[PDB]
Structures are given as structure tokens and as C-alpha cells.
Amino acid sequence: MELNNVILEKEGKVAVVTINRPKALNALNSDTLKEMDYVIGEIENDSEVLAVILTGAGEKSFVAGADISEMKEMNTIEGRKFGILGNKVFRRLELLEKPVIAAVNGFALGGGCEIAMSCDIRIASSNARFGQPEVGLGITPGFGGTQRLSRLVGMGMAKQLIFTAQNIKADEALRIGLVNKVVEPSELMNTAKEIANKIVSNAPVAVKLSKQAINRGMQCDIDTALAFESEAFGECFSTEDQKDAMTAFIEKRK
């Protein structure tokens, strides 16, 4: 598959996915969604990639939105399918068995907010903006926004942001817990690489399985969630990395 709107780069144990539609401020569309699905595949096909960073081209936009020309003419049944497909790709991102960090370098609006929310971790530049303008365009959020925002920052804030369609600055995104950290633009990528390298310095199956345990156990009652964990915890004791690391830990007396 050819790659017009997205850049995959690999080096060491981390991949960087860069949305790159510099004219339309990195907005999503049919094609850019297909390209993202494809790269998610590449990434899951490679077991030497242990952590991902998703970012936007340039200094102004992470992902501005989705293309409205594409959406304006759709009927009920088409829009529904268009919702299912974007959700398919973002859900795939969320479940991807490597950690994905969203390096939110500017505008994250609409589908851009939604795709950032689909990552494991969000950090922002100080210039970053977050919002869901969809309801001013006569629609709901369409790529999960009605679900991941409340789960991430609580019903109170989610509802306000979604019903008003008003943006918030980086500092406020931090106050409500939508991002984990805020830094200066010139520090964004270094900070994501440092978090990514800490993650990748850890044991991959444990990170892999911990991600699954959090993602899945969060969907259900606490007793079945906790059982889920012990099953995954068991699996870890079948690996080299488990014995080696617990061993070298006990090289503590030296």
C-alpha cells in the first residue's frame, strides 16, 4: 500500500507514526483512516517494535478534525458505516499489544481528539488544544468521542465539552487528566521518546499482558477482572525475561 498522508518510521524499539496532511492541518479522511489501519498492521507484524508514538506533522496541528466534504452528503446508513469504520481503526489502535503514546503537538479536535483518546498515554505541548466541535456540525462525535472522553475525564467534563463544542487549552487538559503531562513544544518529542524508552527498557511480554489486563478488566466487574489478571500473571512465569529479571534483581547484594 502507498503512503501519502501518514509516515511510519522505525528505529530501535520504537515506531513513530506521523499524520502529515500539512495543508489540511493533519485532518482525517477515508484514505488517511485506511492508511492508519495498514500501519497498525505493520506495527503488529513486527515483534521488535515495543512502543509507538503517534504525532502530527508541523508545529500547529496534531490532528485538526476529519474532512467534512466527505461527510456532508452521506445518508443515515452511510454515516453509520463511516462511524463503524473509523471506530474499527481506533479500537484496533487501543488494543494493539504495544503501548501507544500520543504526542499532541497542537490542535486535537474532533477525530483528532478521538484518535488521541485511543492511545494508552497522552502528553501535550503547551500550545495544544482539545475539543469536540461535532455537535455544531449537526452530529455526535463519530469515532468514539461519546465514550472515551467520559471514561478518561469523567461524565461532568465530557458532557460539557461535547454539548458546548468548545475547546480547552493544554493546561486545562492536564487539570482534568486528559493528558498526563504538558511540556514546551521543543520538548514534546524528547519527552515521548523518554517515556517510550523507559517502557521499552521493560520486559515486553509483561507490558503486552499488562496492557491487555487493563484494557479488558476495565470492561467488567472487579471479581472477573481480577481473575483475568491472574491468568495473565501466570503466563509471565513461562518466560525467560521473568526468570532472568527476578534473578538479576536479587543480584541486589552487589
Q: Is 134 a catalytic residue?
A: yes
Determine if 62 is a binding residue for a copy of itself (CB under 8 A). Answer: no
Q: Which position among 9, 163, 171, 190 is part of the footprint of a copy of itself (CB under 8 A)?
A: 163
226-245 residues near a copy of itself, rule: CB under 8 A:
226-239, 241-245
Question: Facing residues of 242 across strands?
Answer: none
Question: CB under 8 Å to 8, separation ≥6 — which residues?
Answer: 15, 16, 17, 18, 39, 42, 43
Active site residue 184: no
Among residue numbers 123 through 162, which ones bind a copy of itself (CB under 8 A)? 134-142, 144-147, 150-160, 162
Determine the longest span between alpha carbons in the chain, in angstroms: 69
Give me the least distance between CB of 189 and a copy of itself, in Å please.
17
Say how many residues make up the chain: 254
Candidates 45, 48, 72, 254; binder of a copy of itself (CB under 8 A) is: 72
Report the residue number, 7 or 44, with the smaller CB distance to a copy of itself: 44
Minimum gap (Å) between residue 1 Cβ and a copy of itself: 15
Distance CA 158, CA 219 (A): 19
Site string for a copy of itself, 171-190 (x = CB under 8 A): -----xxxxx----------
Sign of CA dihedral 30, 32, 35, 39: negative
Q: Which of positions 193-232 make contact with a copy of itself (CB under 8 A)?
A: 195, 198-199, 201-203, 205-207, 209-214, 216-232
152 CB-contact burial (10 Å; exposed 0-12 / middle 13-18 / buried 19+): middle
Residue 224 corresponds to which amino acid? T
Task: Candidates 20, 83, 127, 167: give the one binding a copy of itself (CB under 8 A).
Answer: 83
Distance CA 203, CA 200 (A): 7
Q: Does 75 bind a copy of itself (CB under 8 A)?
A: yes
Contacts of 78 (CB under 8 A, 6+ apart): none
Q: How far is CA 92 from CA 15, 101, 106, in A?
A: 16, 14, 24
Residue in 20, 31, 37, 165 binding a copy of itself, rule: CB under 8 A: 165
Q: Which of 2, 114, 172, 231 is the catalytic position? A: 114
Q: Which of 134, 187, 194, 231 is catalytic?
A: 134
Output 17 or 192, the one with its CB closest to a copy of itself. Answer: 192
**DSSP states of 156-178:** HHHHHHHHH---EEHHHHHHTTS
Q: Which is nearer to a copy of itself, 7 or 84 (CB)?
A: 84
Q: How far is the CB of 198 from a copy of itself (least distance, A)?
A: 4
Residues that are catalytic: 114, 134
